[PDB]
Structures are given as structure tokens and as C-alpha cells.
Write a protein that binds this ligand. Structure first.
Ligand code: NA
Length: 94
């Protein structure tokens, strides 16, 4: 059993029709969320049935996702959340 959240998240990231707001990084080892306000207003209701970024991020945290930042516009990642590898979602837990 792979949690519906992860399957939906993988499909959403991979969808080219949504890449303006959420997409894979070039290497496919992480994903980006652009325009958080628009993302929460437009994408989250359609795919996750709410409009709250904090709730979305809480789910990411629950599954052990990390945030990627520049060394001294949000990038999230999990070692088993990879482009073209939906079958690896089975290894994500929590
Ligand atoms: Na996408």
C-alpha cells in the first residue's frame, strides 16, 4: 500500500501541464513549487481538496521530505521520490 498522498504528489509533479507551478528539478531528484500563493489557491484545491500550504507541507514532513536551499522558490526532496520512478514510492514511510 502506497499512501494516496504520495501517488497524487508524484503524478502532479510529473504532469507537464502543471510545471509552471510544480515540477521536477533538472536532475529529477527533487521538485520545485513556484508561486506558493497561486499554488495553494489553484493546485492544492484541485488535487488535495484544500487551499492550505501548511497542511501540504505537514504531509511532506510526515513522509520525511527535506527542504533544499542555496548555500549562503521552495525545493523539496526524498531519496525515493524521483522522476520516472513511481514504483519507488513504496519505500517511503511514516
Ligand atoms: Na508538474
Amino acid at each position: 500500500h502506497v499512501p494516496a498522498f504520495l501517488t497524487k504528489l508524484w503524478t502532479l509533479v510529473s504532469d507537464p501541464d502543471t510545471d509552471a507551478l510544480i515540477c521536477w528539478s533538472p536532475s529529477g531528484n527533487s521538485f520545485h513549487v513556484f508561486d506558493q500563493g497561486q499554488f495553494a489557491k489553484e493546485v492544492l484545491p484541485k488535487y488535495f481538496k484544500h487551499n492550505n500550504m501548511a497542511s501540504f507541507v505537514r504531509q511532506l514532513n510526515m513522509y520525511g521530505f527535506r527542504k533544499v536551499v542555496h548555500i549562503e522558490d521552495t525545493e523539496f526532496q526524498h531519496p525515493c521520490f524521483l522522476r520516472g520512478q513511481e514504483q519507488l514510492l513504496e519505500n517511503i514511510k511514516r
